[PDB]
Design a protein around this ligand. Sequence first.
Ligand SMILES: CC(C)(C)OC(=O)Nc1cccc2cc([B-](O)(O)O)sc12
Ligand SMILES: [Ca+2]
Ligand SMILES: [Ca+2]
Ligand SMILES: [Zn+2]
Ligand SMILES: [Zn+2]
Length: 225
Amino acid sequence: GDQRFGDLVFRQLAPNVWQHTSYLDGAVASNGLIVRDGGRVLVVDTAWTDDQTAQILNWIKQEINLPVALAVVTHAHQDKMGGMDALHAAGIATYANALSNQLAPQEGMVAAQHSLTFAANGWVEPATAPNFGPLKVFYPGPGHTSDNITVGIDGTDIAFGGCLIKDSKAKSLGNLGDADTEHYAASARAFGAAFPKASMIVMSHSAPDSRAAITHTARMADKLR
Ligand SMILES: CC(C)(C)OC(=O)Nc1cccc2cc([B-](O)(O)O)sc12
Ligand SMILES: [Ca+2]
Ligand SMILES: [Ca+2]
Ligand SMILES: [Zn+2]
Ligand SMILES: [Zn+2]
């Protein structure tokens, strides 16, 4: 039951949640989310490119036909922020970790329009995340990158680890070029603790998994110290 639109694949995960998948040209998949929140849609992560991100927005108009209120992007790398210009051109309010916005020029990304900040416990400072509906934004600590953030969807089973979390069969932690090898394991575990009842763990580079993806990721990362 996956749907294709252009270069993008969509999979419904829950009545009001879909995974978007885009490919960097041997094609490399990256996943984000689409959430229907009453009369408005919320997006987590861009596609790799502006043209792919415009395809997400066009699919949403065709299949859901509700306005896209805002997008949260989960770190300043191309798979998650490559399509910022497309979001801005479409009039979608964009939010990213302050640190992602600060790193964005140095990582070749366009900054979001708004900065999220976080408490010492990892939870977003709520005044920086106005009207986020069911999206619960959590900074787990440095791991895949220093700026990586994660998102749980309230009212559902379903938390999004972005590029921090790898699937439970993985043999590696992917691209570690910008990683914090010392703190990674703790950050993975902190994600798990933040969303303790999430049973469907969505991530950037594998299909959705169980909580096993969290504990497996942390076990791998333990060996990086
Ligand atoms: C090493 C493999 C995964 C085979 O190839 C890539 O890394 N693809 C990418 C190309 C350009 C840019 C990027 C950024 C990436 B993130 O997952 O660290 O956000 S991946 C990636
Ligand atoms: Ca661009
Ligand atoms: Ca870099
Ligand atoms: Zn990355
Ligand atoms: Zn990635």
